[PDB]
Design a protein around this ligand. Structure first.
Ligand SMILES: *[C@@H]1O[C@H](CO)[C@@H](NC(C)=O)[C@H](O[C@H]2O[C@H](CO)[C@H](O)[C@H](O)[C@H]2O)[C@H]1NC(C)=O
Ligand SMILES: *[C@@H]1O[C@H](CO)[C@@H](NC(C)=O)[C@H](O[C@H]2O[C@H](CO)[C@H](O)[C@H](O)[C@H]2O)[C@H]1NC(C)=O
Ligand SMILES: *[C@@H]1O[C@H](CO)[C@@H](NC(C)=O)[C@H](O[C@H]2O[C@H](CO)[C@H](O)[C@H](O)[C@H]2O)[C@H]1NC(C)=O
Ligand SMILES: *[C@@H]1O[C@H](CO)[C@@H](NC(C)=O)[C@H](O[C@H]2O[C@H](CO)[C@H](O)[C@H](O)[C@H]2O)[C@H]1NC(C)=O
Lengths: 158, 105, 158, 158
């Protein structure tokens, strides 16, 4: 006979949350990845200096002169950050993150410019030789959709 | 947090179920993300008082989707089941938008 | 004989407002707290620098090099922000806020990482020693329900 | 002899619409103003930076580094947004709006905090000196009833 204004408006806010659910869920993940990136960076300094001073990429965190323990460079969504031959990889925690990005990671690596180096940011990579890396293809890479426009670099970016 | 709120206080709502009541609603309790609403005993039909429904959600991964239907219990973080017991509001009294089954996806 | 469509629909919008009342009232409070947090932050800079440059936490706002007057770091819902030995506490005004959060506050404190510091955000805390704080247990803490997921830190968080 | 249930219920929905008419008509206007406010903001950035970098308020849009043309910062209910000496005013279109708010506007202005500035939001204002504005009293101000609780600032708010 009457009461449908309360019933529909409680059910439009319910469906509004369902539509606002995936937007906040990738905005959210995309936000948790933007930090793995900040934790990865700032460690470029150590790595850059080590390379320019010696001409060899730092083998591990201790070589680069950073928390000798990967797990000591963690965060809220970051379970750690390891330096492996100049390549700095950031791992996403398992608690406090999206759902399709946890335990997932990215990498920052550089290239000899000769007198200086240039840095790249993208999906996990392994270093082959002092001037070549390759996709750490394995299945734990953070999905392209979660990576900034500034971190879409490919293993062979120059 | 990636975990469903255990109770009202966890969800950050009137720590007391009875504090989320109404004219026909005797309360609303959050039990592991599942929100159940109980029908008062005074001021209602006759075959719906003391009866209730539930709203529960499901991880969409990055977001969640909500369901509305007859009382349900949460089993695991992504599974609930009919709170079969006899106090569910009869299908005839539920909107077309609240006919969801325990296994709706 | 007739007119119940106008009577029920005016009474469903009335009860719709009553159901929409607590949702807007915690969404609202949760919004007024999210600012006390923004006012508290951005003062991390002063405090961080003071600590790293001297190895001692700033005793008060003036030491940290900020509005020497706590009341000078207020807002709409924020009655102020005081720095007490590196701990930055934000107080909720008494006018313009929820109802169960006014005159209530939170704290931001940091911890020596050795070469850098890490910040925490949560319910009011007091500093004991240069690397230890404790619950400013007293009854004026902003209730957990009003605090973001990013500001649920405990006095002993590391 | 009979048919009054159809006659009354068609006439209760008719009067229900008449009662729901003013509610949707201020909820509506109040909604069209909330945007003039969003269009006004986000231009605070340009204005803030211009002031902090030079110590003088941007004279006009071009100075602030925004669509050199006021009319280029319009919307659905917004006919434009002009920056006049740091004061940003938003004008309500003439088509697509309430009825007692079209061609009407509001202003956002700031104040030197010394090292930073604080923003205000309210009824149209004019800038007198670098730290003083005044009511642009003229009759085209959006009525207090249509302004959010967050945009009730007076010319002398500090
Ligand atoms: C740090 O990175 C260096 C990269 O050249 C690496 N050196 C070489 C030649 O690979 C360092 O390892 C050397 O020093 C450690 C010290 O304990 C050890 O002796 C290794 O045998 C030697 O290669 C890297 N340091 C560490 C601690 O691994
Ligand atoms: C709120 O829901 C939480 C869901 O994870 C739940 N935590 C866990 C781990 O189940 C909270 O309970 C925790 O906190 C309370 C606080 O008194 C108590 O210490 C419990 O032992 C602990 O599990 C839920 N909060 C409450 C108040 O129940
Ligand atoms: C600022 O924080 C400092 C933290 O070390 C604190 N110093 C010490 C040793 O606690 C400053 O106080 C010192 O300087 C003021 C200046 O008037 C005064 O002389 C105090 O006696 C002295 O401790 C803090 N500055 C202020 C103004 O309190
Ligand atoms: C932008 O705002 C400035 C605020 O100081 C204003 N400058 C002054 C001194 O008022 C700019 O105007 C100056 O530059 C324009 C450029 O054509 C013109 O030369 C004016 O004479 C000069 O005042 C403002 N820029 C514009 C384009 O108005």
């Amino acid at each position: 006979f009457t009461l449908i204004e309360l019933m529909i408006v409680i059910a439009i806010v319910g469906i509004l949350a369902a539509v606002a659910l995936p937007a906040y869920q990738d905005y959210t993940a995309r936000a948790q990845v933007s930090e793995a990136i900040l934790l990865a960076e700032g460690q470029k300094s150590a790595v850059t200096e080590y390379y320019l001073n010696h001409g060899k990429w730092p083998e591990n965190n201790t070589s680069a002169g950073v928390a000798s323990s990967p797990t000591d460079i963690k965060g809220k969504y970051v379970k750690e950050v390891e330096v492996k031959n100049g390549v700095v990889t950031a791992t996403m925690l398992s608690s406090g993150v999206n759902n399709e990005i946890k335990g997932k990671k990215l990498s920052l690596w550089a290239r000899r410019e000769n007198g200086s180096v240039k840095w790249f940011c993208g999906q996990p990579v392994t270093r082959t030789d002092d001037d070549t890396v390759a996709d750490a293809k394995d299945g734990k890479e953070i999905d392209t959709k979660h990576l900034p426009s500034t971190c879409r670099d490919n293993f062979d970016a120059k």
